Amino acid sequence: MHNYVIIDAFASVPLEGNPVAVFFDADDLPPAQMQRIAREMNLSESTFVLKPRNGGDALIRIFTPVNELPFAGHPLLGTAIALGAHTDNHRLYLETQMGTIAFELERQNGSVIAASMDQPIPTWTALGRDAELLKALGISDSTFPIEIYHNGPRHVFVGLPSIDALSALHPDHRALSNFHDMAINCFAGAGRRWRSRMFSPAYGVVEDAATGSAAGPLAIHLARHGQIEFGQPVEILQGVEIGRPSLMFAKAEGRAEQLTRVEVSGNGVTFGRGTIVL
Amino acid sequence: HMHNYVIIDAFASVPLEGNPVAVFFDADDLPPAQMQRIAREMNLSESTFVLKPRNGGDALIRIFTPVNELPFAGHPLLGTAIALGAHTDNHRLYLETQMGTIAFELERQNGSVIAASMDQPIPTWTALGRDAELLKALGISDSTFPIEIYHNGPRHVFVGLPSIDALSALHPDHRALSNFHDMAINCFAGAGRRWRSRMFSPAYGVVEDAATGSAAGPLAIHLARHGQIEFGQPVEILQGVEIGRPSLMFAKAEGRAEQLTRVEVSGNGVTFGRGTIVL
Ligand SMILES: N[C@H]1C(C(=O)O)=CC=C[C@@H]1O
Ligand SMILES: N[C@H]1C(C(=O)O)=CC=C[C@@H]1O
């Protein structure tokens, strides 16, 4: 029998942010059963905490309802906040398939409130499928070049001219299903405050509330396209239209040709706790 | 304020099959607005909330999809009945809903509720009258039977497919289907005592549902009306196969078209998990 906790990631109160189900003592579960359990929970991801293999504190496997991911932001944020309760550490090192991700935990009186990760440095290139994507989204143009970033998963970015235009999107999910192993992140905003919406049939979700692995790349994206400065922290608010407002903090340090750090951070809170029969 | 819940996999005898429902106990202190939010947090096709009775039943149940409330629904109530059945020795349970009181018979094995049967509301029906639009949304040219919509609280449209291969091949346009409000699109194929179903409902906040319990009753009526089975003949409807959530619903509609005396839907259910929430 496995205990799990539900964490609302990128939120300071239950019912906001993006839920993840974090399953403890999962070494006995085969990955095919992990996948099935994630299908059962039907949250954007469920995670599994395994004994470490390469010097971290744990090894974390990450599953959408339909696939395994080698890295994801909300799921690992939630896992780090839940795991934080086990110990007194303020530094946590979580192994994933993309490598070991360092976390700084924000604690008060030993109690975990928030966490900050150092993400893998993404690479990027032009999508090369603009007409198709914009048709799918129901729009004419992107405000900035449409590029796709890889840090484990992949994330494509499409800019909108206003927050109203971003909220007005009604994408064709079936057309979006032609975009494999990627999530589509639409953004709008100004200066240090940006809004996002994410759509990914490839990762099993019509619309996700907080796509944590997209936040760092967006910050890169905005700085490469002159809208913010490298090293300038931004707030990205996602999930508003679906009732799941999620605040992601991101900061990309260095320069386009040589990034040195991609930090994403947020609050998380416990929604519930229980146990599954297998 | 804290609430205990159980996750029941409805219309399955083993965990990880069937259709999950999250059942929250002692839920009277949650306003409907918060119940809707909790149902979104769980993100299951439905969550239910167990309230004290007002009309002589055992409990009053409110039912929520990720995006709306429903006056009745079959997998959520089945799972609710199995869950509440653990707390009682009784053979029958009466669950008040907005559609009236639904009677259940509980089946035990050893000291354990393993299944239940309900008597569903008798539906009304008519044609949908929008065949061309719906068929284009589904990605096909027609139905094997007249496209009709049944109402037993929620609404269910039925589109017949000529084979199981044809049914598994559907890749509907979710957005185009969102233009059909307040209903679920149930696509079926099969023969005799054995049918496959797939359900799609942007209106009820699900791309594809695993086991649409309130559709099982109407489908047996629909098949009897259209001469593919006889009234009163039990059928097995297997739903959710293509999404990896095989679910087995048993349905029997007794009487005749002009006068149905019982629409019975039953199935197995199993506990997958349980827990507590912080509000
Ligand atoms: N939660 C998202 C995720 C993330 O980084 O949090 C990556 C890809 C898809 C998921 O829905
Ligand atoms: N499970 C379904 C339901 C039912 O009767 O189980 C009714 C309407 C939509 C839900 O996804």
Q: Are residues A132 and A186 in the same domain?
A: yes
Alpha-carbon span A197 to A186, nearest angstrom: 5
Closest residue to A42, CB basis, from B44, B173, B178: B44
Judging contacts by C-beta atoms under 8 Å, the chain A residues touching residue B273 are: 4, 274-277
* Residue A134 φ then ψ, to 5°: -65, -40
Find all residues with CB under 8 Å of B103, minimum gap 6, and list them: B92, B93, B94, B118, B119
Residues A169 and A99 in one domain: no
Residue of B170, B278, B279 to mutate for A, most A C-beta atoms under 10 A:
B278
Which chain A residue's Cα is nearest to B179?
A170
Q: Do A235 and A276 belong together in one domain?
A: no
Nearest to A277 among B43, B273, B279 (CB): B273
The closest alpha carbon to A20, from A231, A209, A234, belongs to A209
**Using an 8 Å Cβ cutoff, are B236 and B249 in contact?**
yes
CA of B69 to the centre of ligand 1 (A): 28
Of A15, A173, A276, the CB nearest to B175: A173
- Shared domain for B276 and B218, answered yes or no, is no
Helix ranges (DSSP H) in A138-226? 163-168, 173-176, 212-224
B43 touching A, CB under 8 A? yes
Domain span at residue B200 reads 121-268
Q: Are residues B45 and B178 in the same domain?
A: no
Is the Cβ–Cβ distance between A270 and A15 less than 8 Å? no
Clarify whether residues B112 and B152 are in a common domain.
no
Count of pairs with CB atoms under 8 A, one residue in A, one in B: 82
Burial class from Cβ neighbours inside 10 Å (0-12, 13-18, 19+) for residue A277 reads middle
Q: How far is CA B62 from CA B35, B50, B209, in A?
A: 9, 7, 19
The structure was resolved to a resolution in Å of 1.9
Q: Nearest residue of A to residue B275 by CA position?
A: A274
Is A68 considered catalytic here? no
Within 8 A by CB and 6+ apart from A108, the residues are none
- Cβ contact B159:B187 at 8 Å: yes
Same domain? For A63 and A159 the reply is: no
Residue A262 tokens read as 């991609």
C-alpha triplet A131, A132, A134: angle, nearest 5°: 65
Q: Is A171 close to B175, i.e. CB distance below 8 A?
A: yes
- Solved using: X-ray
Task: Report the number of distinct structural domains present in chain A.
Answer: 2
- What's the CATH code of the domain at B226? 3.10.310.10
Question: Distances in Å between the alpha carbon of B123 and those of B45, B194, B209, B213?
Answer: 22, 22, 21, 13
Nearest CA of chain B to the CA of A225: how many Å? 32
CB-based contact, A123 to chain B, within 8 Å: no
B106 shares its domain with B142 = no
Contact call for A206 and B174, based on CB within 8 A: yes
Do residue B116 and residue B137 come from a single domain?
no
Min Cα distance B123 → chain A (Å) is 31
If you measure from the C-alpha of residue B242 to the centroid of ligand 2, how many angstroms do you get, rounded to a whole number?
17
* Sign of the CA dihedral running A129, A130, A131, A137: positive
* Cβ <8 Å between A278 and B15: yes
Query: d(Cα B273, Cα A126) in Å, to the nearest integer?
Result: 45
Considering the domain architecture, whether residues B169 and B41 belong to the same structural domain is answered as: no
List alpha helices for A56-162, DSSP H: 73-84, 130-137
C-alpha pair distances (Å), B107 with each of A118, B16, B28, B74, B278: 53, 21, 28, 17, 33
> B67 and B135 share a domain?
no
Contact residues of ligand 2, CB 6 A cut-off: B 19, 45-46, 70, 73-76, 154, 184, 201, 204, 206, 209, 212-214
Block residue for tokens 């349970």: B93
Nearest to B211 by CA among B249, B177, B178, B175: B249
CA of A257 to the centre of ligand 1 (A): 26
Residues contacting B100, CB < 8 A, separation 6+: B121
Based on the fold, state whether residues A15 and A142 are members of the same structural domain.
Answer: no
> Nearest-CA neighbor of B144 among B187, B111, B80, B180?
B187
